[PDB]
Amino acid sequence: HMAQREVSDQPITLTQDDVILVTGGTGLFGKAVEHIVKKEQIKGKWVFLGSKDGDLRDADACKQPFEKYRPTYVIHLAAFVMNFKVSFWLDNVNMNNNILTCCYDFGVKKTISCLSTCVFPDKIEYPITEEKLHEGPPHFSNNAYAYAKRMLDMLGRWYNEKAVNEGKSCLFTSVIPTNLFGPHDNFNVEAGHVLPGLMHKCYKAQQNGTDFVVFGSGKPLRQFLYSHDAARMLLWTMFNYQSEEPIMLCVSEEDEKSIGQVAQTIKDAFNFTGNMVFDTSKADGQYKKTSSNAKFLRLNPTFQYTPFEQAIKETVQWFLENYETARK
Amino acid sequence: REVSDQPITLTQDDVILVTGGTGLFGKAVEHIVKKEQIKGKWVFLGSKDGDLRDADACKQPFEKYRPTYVIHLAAFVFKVSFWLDNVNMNNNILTCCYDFGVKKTISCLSTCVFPDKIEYPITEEKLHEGPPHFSNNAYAYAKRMLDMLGRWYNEKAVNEGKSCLFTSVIPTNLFGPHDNFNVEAGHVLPGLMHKCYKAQQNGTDFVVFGSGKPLRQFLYSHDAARMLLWTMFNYQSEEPIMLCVSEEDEKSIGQVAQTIKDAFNFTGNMVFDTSKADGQYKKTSSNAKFLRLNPTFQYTPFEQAIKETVQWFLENYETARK
Ligand SMILES: [Cl-]
């Protein structure tokens, strides 16, 4: 199909009659959407679903928010992450089948779903680009979750195929955010991502007078995306991006940071004065795992990212001000 | 190892549930089971037993028959429907097999689910090495996720100390009694039989679409039924096992058509319509694994299998699918 370009000529303008349903809207990424929507006074009725709002795995329960709100746009962020691989497949594929089907049946204009970097093929040449998504099996460790994400992508394409044949205005696409951090992250030191975990380990050292320990050697390099940046990128995707191919949301390779840089940045943001030490008994992760921002950079060249240091200082200030209610 | 030390022996207390059991493959299983006096109560489910896509309806034959073994042959073949109908049915069936303590479950994959870019011969390990062809990729991905779901239920069984094994077979170009003989909608070999019959019955010429040059491996359904039963009794690997004849036994479409003509004693003219285009030349599948594990297996020769299928078709023309 040579017909349409990856972007629309003009952006979609939302009106007050628009209703935007956001599943998984209370996590790190969803709370950032809410922040940007409020800060930039984006029009429309925005509905941020949470766990108490209904079990999206159940087909009938999943129909309830669509019947109630009749959304014109859907941002699908929810995922299930009894820890059995069976559950990871069943719970995610059932919710994904239900959500996308509801989107089609209720005539949602555009639906954006969320994938993650860990669903790409295990055997892969870097940098990761979106076209490589299905080119071989994922890593065995999370392959139930990985395949549900892969079939979430495919189901969107199949629903795009159906919308054409039936003459409906329904578009399905997806974003791939890479290493999000920011307010409302999960700060459990054992179960959280390394960056929010370091923030919690630094805070704990500051309260106890203990040294601040980085579990790696500090050498590996990663690209980190501030959740508020990712939210602006996602809104840009909702307003402009027409392609069914996923789009990576990540910062450039030139902006990669080491764990040691990250941990040092955290220390300065905390103004922690004690010692920061690296535990080399723990083996280092993989050195570089670069993903490619070429498509977004090509399609939105004027986009401005938040400096890493400012994003850490903002994130640390939220953590200090909200420690009691942060997820731990 | 891939094969158990001793074969499973079914008793009169065993109950074997077969989904999709009333087509070509299930009919062959039912035939070998009767011919070889295989024990157990065999239940061949069909549409009348419940919509297996519905999780509750799918539970009914498990609660009713309490199977010890399951052979899962059912499949639905908009792309949306093929993804949803197959993925729900498969999810339901394998979950029921686990929850109800089925000892061994054998599911069925197809040749068309392997990666589009592939080095021939097709071998079982290449199943997930890349995307399938676009034309049927919803059906393909449902089959690939049926394979994965069985491996994942095997992991749960181990972690829980449960005796539930899941595996699968890949039958390649089945033919035989109780096939679909519709000339427009049937597979090449069953369609050709009906075309040859109709040409002999109207006096017309026997017209074969294409040049007759492409080569395929054709497997008699009764052979495949013997291979599947062998797999139930002996095969312990969760890796799928290809069921096909060897590459040396491939036949060309022209060879298929000629054997059919001689089987019907059709004396008129067999012409080739080269205005219709030829499919791919060879799409060869590998039986090395079955050959290594069951080296004494004896196949029905192609001519003998065509003759048996032709006689069944003639004796049961009124009730055959056409
Ligand atoms: Cl991490």
CA separation for the pair B20, B23 (Å, rounded)? 7
Q: Which domains are delineated in chain B?
A: 1-175+217-246+284-300 (3.40.50.720), 176-216+247-283+301-317 (3.90.25.10)
**3-state secondary structure (DSSP) of residue A328:** coil
| DSSP strands (E only) in chain B | 15-19, 41-44, 69-72, 104-108, 165-171, 174-175, 206-209, 215-216, 219-220, 241-243, 251-252, 270-273
**B44 part of contact set with chain A, CB < 8 Å:** no
DSSP alpha helix (H) spans, A109-193? 143-165
A137 contact residues in B (CB cutoff 8 A): 128-129
The torsion angles phi and psi of A137, rounded to 5 degrees, stand at -75, 150
CA separation for the pair B100, B77 (Å, rounded)? 28
Q: Are strands A19-23 and A45-48 parallel, antiparallel or unpaired?
A: parallel
| Residue B106 contacts residue B231 (beta carbons within 8 Å) | yes
Q: What are the structure tokens assigned to A206, written together?
A: 């500051």
CA separation for the pair A226, A134 (Å, rounded)? 27
- For residue A164, what is the nearest residue in chain B, using CA coordinates? B78
Distance of residue B152 Cα from the nearest chain A Cα, in angstroms: 6
The torsion angles phi and psi of B238, rounded to 5 degrees, stand at -80, -10
B49: closest CA among B74, B77, B13?
B74
Amino acid in the structure at residue B85: D
Distance of residue B137 Cα from the nearest chain A Cα, in angstroms: 9
**3-state secondary structure (DSSP) of residue A61:** helix
- For residue A160, what is the nearest residue in chain B, using CA coordinates? B80
- B5 by Cβ neighbours in 10 Å (0-12 / 13-18 / 19+) ranks as exposed
CA separation for the pair B61, B49 (Å, rounded)? 7
**3-state secondary structure (DSSP) of residue B243:** strand
Q: Which helix (H) or strand (E) holds A45?
A: strand A45-48
| Residue B308 contacts residue B176 (beta carbons within 8 Å) | yes
* DSSP 8-state assignment for residue B165: E
Bridge partners of A295? none
| Residue B63 contacts residue B79 (beta carbons within 8 Å) | no
CB contact under 8 A, A86 and B153: yes
**A151 part of contact set with chain B, CB < 8 Å:** yes
Long-range contacts of A87-90 (CB under 8 A, 24+ apart): A88/A142, A88/A144, A88/A145, A88/A148, A89/A144, A89/A145, A89/A147, A89/A148, A89/B145, A89/B148, A89/B149, A89/B152, A90/A57, A90/B91, A90/B95
Query: Residue A33 CB: number of other CB atoms within 10 A?
Result: 25
CA separation for the pair B306, A188 (Å, rounded)? 67
Query: Residue A18 CB: number of other CB atoms within 10 A?
Result: 17
CA separation for the pair A74, B60 (Å, rounded)? 37
How many CA within 13 A on the CB side of residue A138? Answer: 20
B220: closest CA among B24, B63, B80?
B24
- For residue A87, what is the nearest residue in chain B, using CA coordinates? B152
**A162 part of contact set with chain B, CB < 8 Å:** yes
Owner of token pair 């069943």: A90
A230: closest CA among A305, A316, A315, A323?
A305
CA separation for the pair A242, A229 (Å, rounded)? 20
Mutate to test the interface with A, among B141, B144, B146 (most CBs of A within 10 A): B141
- Of the candidates B95, B98, B131, the beta carbon closest to that of A134 is on B131
CA separation for the pair B151, B77 (Å, rounded)? 23
CA separation for the pair A25, B129 (Å, rounded)? 35
CA separation for the pair A200, A262 (Å, rounded)? 13
Residues 6 or more apart from A155 whose CB is under 8 A from it? A96, A97, A100, A172, B80, B83
Amino acid in the structure at residue A91: D
Ligand 1 mean position, distance from CA A180 (Å) = 9
CA of A78: how far to CAs of A7, A57, A174, A220, in Å?
25, 11, 13, 29
CA of A20: how far to CAs of A17, A35, A51, A53, in Å?
10, 15, 18, 16
| Residue A4 contacts residue A56 (beta carbons within 8 Å) | no
**B136 part of contact set with chain A, CB < 8 Å:** no
A94 contact residues in B (CB cutoff 8 A): 91
**A93 part of contact set with chain B, CB < 8 Å:** yes
B16: closest CA among B123, B77, B106?
B106
Long-range contacts of B96-101 (CB under 8 A, 24+ apart): B96/B58, B96/B59, B96/B62, B97/B62, B97/B70, B97/B72, B97/B153, B97/B164, B97/B166, B98/A86, B98/B153, B98/B156, B98/B157, B98/B162, B98/B164, B99/B62, B100/B62, B100/B63, B100/B66, B100/B67, B101/B162, B101/B163, B101/B164
Chain mean position to CA B308 = 19
* CA angle, A223 then A226 then A229, to 5°: 115
Q: Are strands A257-258 and A221-222 parallel, antiparallel or unpaired?
A: antiparallel
Owner of token pair 């054998």: B106
B50: closest CA among B39, B40, B65?
B65
Q: Which helix (H) or strand (E) holds A176?
A: strand A171-177
**3-state secondary structure (DSSP) of residue A172:** strand
CB contact under 8 A, A101 and B84: yes
Burial A246-265 (b: 16+ CB within 10 A, else e): bbbbbbeeeebbebbebbbb
Q: What are the structure tokens assigned to B10, written together?
A: 């079914």
A154 contact residues in B (CB cutoff 8 A): 83, 137-138, 141
| Residue A291 contacts residue A128 (beta carbons within 8 Å) | yes
Solved by what technique?
X-ray
**What are the DSSP calls for B56-100, one per residue?**
HHHHHHHHHH--SEEEE------HHHHHHHHHHHHHHHHHHHHHT
Catalytic residue (choose from B69, B98, B139, B235): B139
CA separation for the pair A169, A242 (Å, rounded)? 12
Residues 6 or more apart from B260 whose CB is under 8 A from it? B189, B192, B193, B196, B266, B306, B310
- For residue A122, what is the nearest residue in chain B, using CA coordinates? B129
A151 contact residues in B (CB cutoff 8 A): 83, 87, 141, 145
| Residue A211 contacts residue A267 (beta carbons within 8 Å) | no
**B139 noted as active-site residue:** yes
The torsion angles phi and psi of A302, rounded to 5 degrees, stand at -90, 10
CA separation for the pair A288, A258 (Å, rounded)? 10
Q: Are strands B165-171 and B174-175 parallel, antiparallel or unpaired?
A: unpaired
**B159 part of contact set with chain A, CB < 8 Å:** yes
The torsion angles phi and psi of A113, rounded to 5 degrees, stand at -105, 170
Resolution, expressed in angstroms to one decimal: 2.5
| Residue A180 contacts residue A33 (beta carbons within 8 Å) | no
Bridge partners of A112? A75, A173
**A139 part of contact set with chain B, CB < 8 Å:** no
- For residue B145, what is the nearest residue in chain A, using CA coordinates? A147
B56 contact residues in A (CB cutoff 8 A): none
- Of the candidates A94, A158, A165, the beta carbon closest to that of B83 is on A158
